[PDB]
Structure 1
Amino acid sequence: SDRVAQLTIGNSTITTQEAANIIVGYGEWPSYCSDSDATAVDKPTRPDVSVNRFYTLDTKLWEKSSKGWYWKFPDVLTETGVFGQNAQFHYLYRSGFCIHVQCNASKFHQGALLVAVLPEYVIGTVAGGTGTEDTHPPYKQTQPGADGFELQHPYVLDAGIPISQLTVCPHQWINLRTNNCATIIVPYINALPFDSALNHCNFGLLVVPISPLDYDQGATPVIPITITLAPMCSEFAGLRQAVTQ
């Protein structure tokens, strides 16, 4: 009765029988931009059901040695369905998201993943190892698209900051003996009312094992982690031709 849940939005429904409640980031729900916060004058377009729905974008395999992954929003969706098309045809975009990370196992497997959302997740490089070289992350690393990207140094989140403090950001844990999913609702976060869905990634989704996956020989060894997400209150403005980047 807090362990069970149903998420319905658009023409999509998600069910879970081992949930751990729902997190509403920074304590507030997604909402459309008000007339006083807005600055752009064209009347926006709010597609509703055709874009605010659940998209299942990717599946990763959790292994005893996995270091962790991250995805960028709205990057993961810029090339998917009707949401992607609007993001490409418009200069301005804004929305929130309902993120549902899925991972189930058996009562004999163990392990815990930390699922967190970190706004403005700027990636850094190891600087040629010695730190004397000002190298920079390539486009495929800063905006990895739907496949996501694997962390090289999870302890410092590939950005010189302690993952041990990542819990100061909206999160949930997927601890196999307890739940099989994490659900986080995130409002629009930015210093501007609208922005480019292409040039700016508002936040990153981090899925990192903190307690390694373990099980005895004989138990199903393939333990997938699937990422499903839904845009909420999507708004678009500044129409012209489609642009991919």
Structure 2
Amino acid sequence: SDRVRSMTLGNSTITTQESANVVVGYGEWPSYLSDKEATAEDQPTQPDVATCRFYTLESVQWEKSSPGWWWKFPEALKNMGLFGQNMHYHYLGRAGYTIHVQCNASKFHQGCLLVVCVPEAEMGCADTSTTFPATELTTEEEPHVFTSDSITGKKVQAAVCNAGMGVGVGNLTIFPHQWINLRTNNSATIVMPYINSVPMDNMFRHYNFTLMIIPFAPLNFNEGATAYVPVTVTIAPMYAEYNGLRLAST
């Protein structure tokens, strides 16, 4: 059946029993950078399993009032195994991420998550005049929550309706998107390839994409149901190739 799925990228494996078809990012499977499309002359470091494995990020509780969360990849993968180590020790890096968001909910739970990988989701500042610091959008440890309404200050505009990029969140399905509907789905897998203008880019200054998990239907459970419904992102970079060995950047 299509509901069952098993992804064995690297050492870590993910097995699911209610998971719809995995959304290959824009219909193209990730692969190593070809010689035709390569602009860096350094020898590419290609750990097939050291870095191309499923990294389980911090699980965030999907509350009833939770408007959404976002992870900024690949910067959200800092301090996460040898992928983060290679990020630190390389000037240029390319990876195709097969994000797998796990939301285990019972048959009595009402809710739906748009798990969408937005390539280059330029976030808007809460105050348009200024620019937010890096901490406001970076997702090194915890997902950055979209606010239900407008916020102010030197932060990221977290209005869920505008998805933080001045863009209609309902139209976010234009990007590689999968829906975790607790009626049917408990996990969404998006195999997003390396998406950038330059064939390889630095993994700190530039975030290749943002995984936005937007609860369009808020979690609705009657009393007695599990209140701590976790939204666990398990992202596995695929065909990760790095050029430009350098001093570790911290």
TM-score between the two structures when normalised by the length of structure 1: 0.94
Alignment of 1:1-245 (within 5 A): 1-127=1-127, 134-152=129-147, 153-244=159-250
Instruction: Give 1:175 shift.
Output: 0.8
Taking the aligned partners of 1:217 and 1:150, their CA distance within structure 2 comes to: 25
More strand by proportion, 1 or 2? 1
Q: Deviations over 1:118-173 (max 9, x none)?
A: 1111111232xxxxx61211211222313120112100012211101111111111
Cα RMSD, aligned residues only: 1.1
Query: Which structure 1 segments of 5+ residues have no match?
Result: 128-132
Taking the aligned partners of 1:42 and 1:3, their CA distance within structure 2 comes to: 42
Taking the aligned partners of 1:38 and 1:159, their CA distance within structure 2 comes to: 30
The answer to whether the Cα contact below 8 Å between 2:115 and 2:214 also exists between their aligned partners in 1 is yes
Query: Which structure 2 segments of 5+ residues have no match?
Result: 148-158
Question: Residue type of the partner of 1:103?
Answer: C
Bigger radius of gyration among the two? 1
The answer to whether the Cα contact below 8 Å between 1:174 and 1:182 also exists between their aligned partners in 2 is yes
**Corresponding position of 2:151:** none
Specify the SS of the correspondent of 2:42: coil
Q: How many equivalent residue pairs?
A: 239
More helix by proportion, 1 or 2? 1
TM-score between the two structures when normalised by the length of structure 2: 0.93
**Structure 1 segments of 4 or more deviating over 2 A?**
none
Taking the aligned partners of 1:95 and 1:219, their CA distance within structure 2 comes to: 39
Taking the aligned partners of 2:228 and 2:45, their CA distance within structure 1 comes to: 43
Percent of aligned pairs sharing the same letter = 54
